[PDB]
Amino acid sequence: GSSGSSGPVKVLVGKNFEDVAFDEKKNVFVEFYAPWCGHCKQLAPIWDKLGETYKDHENIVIAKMDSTANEVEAVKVHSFPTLKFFPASADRTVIDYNGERTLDGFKKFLESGGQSGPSSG
């Protein structure tokens, strides 16, 4: 390796967030973290370790966005760390990640294809 640029996890911004995150025929799993939220500070590495796993995938594309630095109406985050799975839908459909929030746990939710059971609200 002489000099590379690509990264493990894509970096979504409030400028082209929906442009990249929300992609048809593509399962993009975004992660709304906080530069202050302690719990998030621990997800930084775990999220980077998972992104590299699906960095060269076909439909699975990991991405991270700073909800504290970027605000979008397409998604309202009132807590962190907050994860949201974007199914391969032309629309701005979003799914709530109710897993274990673990490197290995993520693979389970993804590998499945964003299949979560209807929980009570």
Cα distances (Å, whole numbers) of residue 101 to 31, 70, 88, 106: 11, 22, 21, 6
How many residues would you count in the chain? 121
**8 A C-beta contact, residue 93 and residue 105:** no
Experimental technique, in short, is NMR
Compute the radius of gyration of the chain from its Cα atoms: 14
Active site residue 37: yes
- Tokens linked to 26: 């593509």
What is the topology classification, in CATH, of domain 9-114?
Answer: Glutaredoxin (3.40.30)
**8 A C-beta contact, residue 26 and residue 71:** no
Q: Which spans in the chain are helix H? A: 17-20, 38-51, 103-112
**8 A C-beta contact, residue 69 and residue 35:** yes
Q: Of these residues, 34, 40, 62, 83, which one is catalytic?
A: 40
**8 A C-beta contact, residue 75 and residue 84:** yes
Q: Of these residues, 37, 44, 88, 103, which one is catalytic?
A: 37
Active site residue 58: no
- Taking Cα atoms as reference points, which of 80, 91, 77, 106 lies closest to residue 18? 91
What type of residue sits at position 79?
Answer: S
